[PDB]
Amino acid sequence: ASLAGAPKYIEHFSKFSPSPLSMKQFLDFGSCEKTSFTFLRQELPVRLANIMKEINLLPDRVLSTPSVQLVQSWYVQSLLDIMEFLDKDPEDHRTLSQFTDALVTIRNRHNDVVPTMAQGVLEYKDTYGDDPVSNQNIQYFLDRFYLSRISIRMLINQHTLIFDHIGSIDPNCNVSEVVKDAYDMAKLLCDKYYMASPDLEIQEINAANSKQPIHMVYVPSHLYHMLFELFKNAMRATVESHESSLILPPIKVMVALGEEDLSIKMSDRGGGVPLRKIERLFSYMYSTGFGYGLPISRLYAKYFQGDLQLFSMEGFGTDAVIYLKALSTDSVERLPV
Amino acid sequence: ASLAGAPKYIEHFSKFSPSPLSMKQFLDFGSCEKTSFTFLRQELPVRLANIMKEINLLPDRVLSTPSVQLVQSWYVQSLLDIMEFLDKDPEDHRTLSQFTDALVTIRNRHNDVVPTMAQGVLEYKDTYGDDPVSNQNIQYFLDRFYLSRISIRMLINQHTLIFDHIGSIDPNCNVSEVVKDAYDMAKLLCDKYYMASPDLEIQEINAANSKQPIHMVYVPSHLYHMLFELFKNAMRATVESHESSLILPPIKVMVALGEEDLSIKMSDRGGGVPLRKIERLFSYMYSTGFGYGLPISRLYAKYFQGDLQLFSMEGFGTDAVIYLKALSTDSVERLPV
Numbered sequence: 001a002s003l004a005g006a007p008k009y010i011e012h013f014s015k016f017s018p019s020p021l022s023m024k025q026f027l028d029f030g031s032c033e034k035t036s037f038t039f040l041r042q043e044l045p046v047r048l049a050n051i052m053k054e055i056n057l058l059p060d061r062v063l064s065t066p067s068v069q070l071v072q073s074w075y076v077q078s079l080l081d082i083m084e085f086l087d088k089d090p091e092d093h094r095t096l097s098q099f100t101d102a103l104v105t106i107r108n109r110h111n112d113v114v115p116t117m118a119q120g121v122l123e124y125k126d127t128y129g130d131d132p133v134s135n136q137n138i139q140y141f142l143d144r145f146y147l148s149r150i151s152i153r154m155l156i157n158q159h160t161l162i163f164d165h166i167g168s169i170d171p172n173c174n175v176s177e178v179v180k181d182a183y184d185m186a187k188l189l190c191d192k193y194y195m196a197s198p199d200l201e202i203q204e205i206n207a208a209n210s211k212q213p214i215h216m217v218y219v220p221s222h223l224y225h226m227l228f229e230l231f232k233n234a235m236r237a238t239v240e241s242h243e244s245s246l247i248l249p250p251i252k253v254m255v256a257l258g259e260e261d262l263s264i265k266m267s268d269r270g271g272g273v274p275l276r277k278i279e280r281l282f283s284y285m286y287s288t289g290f291g292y293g294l295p296i297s298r299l300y301a302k303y304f305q306g307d308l309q310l311f312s313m314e315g316f317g318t319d320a321v322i323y324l325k326a327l328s329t330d331s332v333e334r335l336p337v
Numbered sequence: 338a339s340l341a342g343a344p345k346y347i348e349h350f351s352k353f354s355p356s357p358l359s360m361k362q363f364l365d366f367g368s369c370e371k372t373s374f375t376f377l378r379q380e381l382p383v384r385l386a387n388i389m390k391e392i393n394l395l396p397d398r399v400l401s402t403p404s405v406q407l408v409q410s411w412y413v414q415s416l417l418d419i420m421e422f423l424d425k426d427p428e429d430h431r432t433l434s435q436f437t438d439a440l441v442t443i444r445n446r447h448n449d450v451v452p453t454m455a456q457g458v459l460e461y462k463d464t465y466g467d468d469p470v471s472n473q474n475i476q477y478f479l480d481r482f483y484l485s486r487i488s489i490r491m492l493i494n495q496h497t498l499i500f501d502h503i504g505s506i507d508p509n510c511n512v513s514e515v516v517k518d519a520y521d522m523a524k525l526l527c528d529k530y531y532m533a534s535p536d537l538e539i540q541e542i543n544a545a546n547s548k549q550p551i552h553m554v555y556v557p558s559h560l561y562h563m564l565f566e567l568f569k570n571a572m573r574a575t576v577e578s579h580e581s582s583l584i585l586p587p588i589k590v591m592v593a594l595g596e597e598d599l600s601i602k603m604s605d606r607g608g609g610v611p612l613r614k615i616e617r618l619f620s621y622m623y624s625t626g627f628g629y630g631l632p633i634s635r636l637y638a639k640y641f642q643g644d645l646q647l648f649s650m651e652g653f654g655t656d657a658v659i660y661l662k663a664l665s666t667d668s669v670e671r672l673p674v
């Protein structure tokens with residue numbers, strides 16, 4: 001498998017659709033190494049090729065930029081890396097240890113995709129302008145590209161973490177503990193930079209089981225990313241809007257478990273933002289050191305059929321809500337095709 | 338002016354765009370009767386004709402239904418009614434009193450447009466089905482049709498109320514008083530049907546002027562419609578979800594005045610609704626005795642560049658937020674063309 005054939009390989013694997021997995025399917029893969037290897041040596045080329053194919057439909061004024069060429073070159077090489085295993089023997093534990101090595105190599109190769117693509121967006125704004133039709137095309141492409149990337153990293157994480165909790169999945173994730181972890185980290189940073197920090201109040205509403213702590217099947221590192229990014233915004237809003245004031249109102253988090261939704265609301269009194277400016281917070285172009293950012297945090301929520309929404313009261317504060325599927329049977333990869 | 342010419346009249350006035358007015362423009366018209374008459378005998382035919390023209394682009398399977406034919410016949414007759422004044426003398430106070438009479442006649446003629454169009458939607462669902470592409474075409478058309486109608490009624494209301502507060506506009510509308518009025522009315526109904534009602538707690542956040550009651554330039558009957566519809570849902574949710582319970586949690590309303598937004602949040606603990614079901618609450622087709630309904634309430638908010646949004650926490654409750662423009666210079670008719 002070589003560069004010279006790559007367009008042919010991409011074209012072949014792009015005829016397949018990616019196979020969205022559910023949380024249960026993920027738990028079963030990690031309860032099997034030969035089975036994971038056999039699945040991934042077909043599925044990873046399919047996912048790599050479907051996104052490489054969509055990248056090739058970008059206008060030439062985008063395709064010809066260094067950042068997109070660099071990222072494309074990484075995806076080609078990763079596809080090549082996996083194709084070497086298509087004719088290898090699953091029964092042969094040197095195959096399997098080699099595969100795991102090649103996956104860690106691919107994952108690390110792609111570590112800088114987000115800041116690389118972000119540089120491309122910055123350039124686009126200066127070379128062609130930040131108009132509303134550009135924003136919508138960029139938003140469409142990058143949501144799909146970044147969601148594709150999250151799903152590829154998920155597959156790789158599951159394999160390399162299990163065949164050395166179920167990999168990155170916690171079958172009994174305690175939501176309030178992840179909330180407290182992300183808050184504690186944000187507070188460290190907030191204390192450093194601003195000298196003080198709001199408190200945290202957590203309330204749980206377990207509708208069907210009023211006493212019981214709220215747990216779920218989820219990927220706690222994904223949940224942490226989302227919550228940490230939200231705490232950072234809520235703390236910065238709270239501190240900077242109360243400089244002439246003495247008390248810092250707390251940040252209040254409610255965790256509600258319903259029949260279908262597990263909802264996490266973070267409420268601050270940071271002064272809020274006019275409705276007209278909420279949308280731009282999720283824009284790759286209009287947002288153009290710690291945390292993944294609001295656009296990407298929302299993609300983590302969407303990845304397993306959830307969502308992340310902001311609603312503010314200008315002059316008062318902002319509510320941020322993470323919506324997750326409560327049932328792991330509804331927790332299914334959302335994959336671009 | 339006669340039925341036989343109507344297609345020609347529609348075609349002529351449809352070449353003009355409606356002229357969106359701001360709150361100030363409305364205040365100036367009502368501080369002038371000849372000027373209002375001269376404006377409206379051109380603007381009303383333009384608004385009537387622009388919506389009649391869009392109605393004619395509906396599929397024949399919609400156009401040929403009795404409800405749409407009935408409504409079309411009302412609009413034609415109303416256009417005809419106004420065209421008789423195109424060659425009349427503003428200086429002649431019998432013209433003006435006649436005009437006001439013809440406007441009251443038009444307004445009353447159109448009183449039943451919403452239940453008439455609603456009957457058409459019910460029929461469509463049974464004769465062709467309630468599929469997602471149908472829902473989106475219906476939503477698109479009816480939002481525009483109903484917003485057009487609100488704007489025509491606004492123009493008529495301003496003329497007939499002033500030339501017998503500035504008509505239907507209160508230059509110093511006290512928002513919390515309208516909140517209390519709509520609550521008191523909903524409580525009467527709620528007490529009747531359910532025997533009890535939640536309490537109301539109101540909090541005001543006047544960011545720039547912490548002490549001062551929150552006032553605005555607005556159409557308080559529009560604000561009442563929106564708030565009454567919201568109270569009705571919040572009360573029904575609160576009572577019906579606490580039947581096996583003893584206490585009814587209050588309904589809490591926050592009124593925030595910011596630099597750009599005046600925001601009104603109504604929070605209940607009615608148990609909420611899964612995210613997946615929020616959208617259908619605004620659907621004409623999926624919603625298919627007191628109050629205008631959620632879809633139409635949102636249009637009243639949108640009419641002067643506001644909005645109405647719902648966000649829920651399944652298992653806990655729901656927040657409803659009315660977003661209005663704080664500044665009457667930003668309060669401009671939103672008109673379909």
Ligand SMILES: NC(=O)C[C@H](N)C(=O)N1CCC(Nc2ccc3cn(S(=O)(=O)c4ccc(O)cc4O)cc3c2)CC1
Nearest residue numbers: 230233234236237240241268270271272273312318320
């Ligand atoms: N000159 C100054 O900076 C002092 C000035 N007097 C003042 O009070 N100001 C001006 C600076 C301003 N700073 C910030 C910083 C960060 C802010 C974030 N929100 S948000 O947009 O509602 C928001 C967004 C996502 C989220 O997840 C939570 C959220 O809440 C408002 C902010 C406001 C606060 C108000």
Ligand SMILES: NC(=O)C[C@H](N)C(=O)N1CCC(Nc2ccc3cn(S(=O)(=O)c4ccc(O)cc4O)cc3c2)CC1
Nearest residue numbers: 567570571573574577578605607608609610649655657
């Ligand atoms: N069998 C029964 O009916 C009793 C049962 N045990 C029960 O508790 N139930 C079932 C019936 C149910 N009834 C209702 C009625 C009306 C309801 C309205 N919301 S909302 O959708 O969140 C909502 C919408 C717009 C708004 O502006 C404010 C809002 O809040 C939930 C409701 C719930 C409440 C919960």
